[PDB]
Scaffold this active site. Sequence first.
Site, mmCIF file in Angstrom:
data_model
loop_
_atom_site.group_PDB
_atom_site.id
_atom_site.type_symbol
_atom_site.label_atom_id
_atom_site.label_comp_id
_atom_site.label_asym_id
_atom_site.label_seq_id
_atom_site.Cartn_x
_atom_site.Cartn_y
_atom_site.Cartn_z
ATOM 1 N N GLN A 20 0.838 -1.228 0.000
ATOM 2 C CA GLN A 20 0.000 0.000 0.000
ATOM 3 C C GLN A 20 0.872 1.277 0.000
ATOM 4 O O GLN A 20 0.411 2.315 -0.479
ATOM 5 C CB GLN A 20 -1.020 -0.076 1.139
ATOM 6 C CG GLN A 20 -0.431 0.049 2.531
ATOM 7 C CD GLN A 20 -1.574 -0.048 3.530
ATOM 8 O OE1 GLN A 20 -2.094 -1.128 3.840
ATOM 9 N NE2 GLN A 20 -2.032 1.113 3.986
ATOM 10 N N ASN A 185 -1.845 -9.319 4.615
ATOM 11 C CA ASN A 185 -1.642 -7.875 4.910
ATOM 12 C C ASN A 185 -1.359 -7.221 3.552
ATOM 13 O O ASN A 185 -1.225 -7.961 2.539
ATOM 14 C CB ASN A 185 -0.564 -7.641 5.982
ATOM 15 C CG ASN A 185 -0.497 -6.234 6.561
ATOM 16 O OD1 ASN A 185 -1.429 -5.411 6.385
ATOM 17 N ND2 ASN A 185 0.626 -5.935 7.207
#
Lengths: 220, 222
Positions: A20, A185
């Site tokens: 991210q 994740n």
Amino acid sequence: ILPDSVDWREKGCVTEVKYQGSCGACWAFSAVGALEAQLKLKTGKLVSLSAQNLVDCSTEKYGNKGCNGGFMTTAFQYIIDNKGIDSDASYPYKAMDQKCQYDSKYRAATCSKYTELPYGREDVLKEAVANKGPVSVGVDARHPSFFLYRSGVYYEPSCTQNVNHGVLVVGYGDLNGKEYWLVKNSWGHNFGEEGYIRMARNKGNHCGIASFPSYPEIHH
Amino acid sequence: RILPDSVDWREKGCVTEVKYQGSCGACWAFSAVGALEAQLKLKTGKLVSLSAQNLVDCSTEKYGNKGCNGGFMTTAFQYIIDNKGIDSDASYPYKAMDQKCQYDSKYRAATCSKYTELPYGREDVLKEAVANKGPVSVGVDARHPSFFLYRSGVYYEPSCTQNVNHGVLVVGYGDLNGKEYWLVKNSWGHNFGEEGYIRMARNKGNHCGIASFPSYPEIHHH
Ligand SMILES: CNC(=O)CCS(=O)(=O)N1CCN(c2ccc3nncn3n2)CC1
Ligand SMILES: CNC(=O)CCS(=O)(=O)N1CCN(c2ccc3nncn3n2)CC1
């Protein structure tokens, strides 16, 4: 009777770990991860879906703030209302807020509905993961231990049910009888167990993992 | 689609008197008990104010709630499920502050068996739920100066957003002078708006996020 252990990676329903970067788009990665499994179950194709499409298009009207946070459920509702989400290939991730560049010519997935699981029920989450697929959840990751995690079953005594980080439950099991959730994740393949964290399961809804679970579905 | 054009759950005696939350951010708690009050009346025939203070003091960290500093109507409902009850307002009165959990099953006035979250932003689904199930817990954006000053008519604030900050109760819907509205019970006492109610714009692009996060509890037969 539910299976003792599940891993949706063994069923070819989980894409490569994404990164991210400095954009708080975990909610977007959580939502596309769940939908990616349902797309594989529906079409036989494992396709990374566009987290950037959610950051840029599932905005104020969905109560989302792009790189400043949002909701997996309102992401799913955006995909419903929008009648699609683009491929990651066609609409790649830039770790920034951009103008909505959605184009139906690059649609890789639809969503017909989503389901929110009951607050804090680890048994209901186990059923959903065994029976339906990977499940978008929020966890409390605002402890240094989460960042320093490398291997094994994560347990943080200071953990709360004030969740702030969107992730994907892709399985569950036990490590020598220590029960865990297998969590994909979005902090890249170097974080924890090559992008995964095993978070304590049946430990009083640890870090709020079963606080706000949801999964999308595709018509047919 | 096939719903009545207007609903007002006060016509069925399913809505308690408007409450005053004071300087405690317990709107989430007022929203939750308000919804459960209607379901209690539909089930038992009796209208009873339920204890918002019970939620503030007892539906805490475990439920992701912070009492006078905010919380969630859904996790409130889950607390009443797990706790197997909620005390009456009369037995566990509202003090506008965080206290130690004093729940006592001796003063239980209601239970909850489940709750339902409506799909994000769907005003037609909210209309069906208000017609067919009863009053619905929602969040609105009540941050804008216009909201505090509302007195009459149908509230439409162009600067309104879907960033909701305030828990309230949809008790009905209809249309006033060619404007569709939601009938919203607030928790700022009867000095606010129309004796404690605001009519908020309906079918106006999910105005102030009214249809963003709706939920309603139920009570089962056993
Ligand atoms: C920058 N970080 C993020 O964008 C992550 C956001 S999250 O995953 O931490 N999580 C998403 C789901 N959310 C709720 C809350 C109440 C509720 N009632 N029903 C469903 N929910 N969902 C809480 C927050
Ligand atoms: C002091 N102020 C308050 O306590 C008011 C809180 S509220 O009524 O504004 N509202 C409750 C419902 N909530 C969500 C969020 C995400 C979600 N995803 N699914 C359901 N939800 N619900 C948003 C907040």
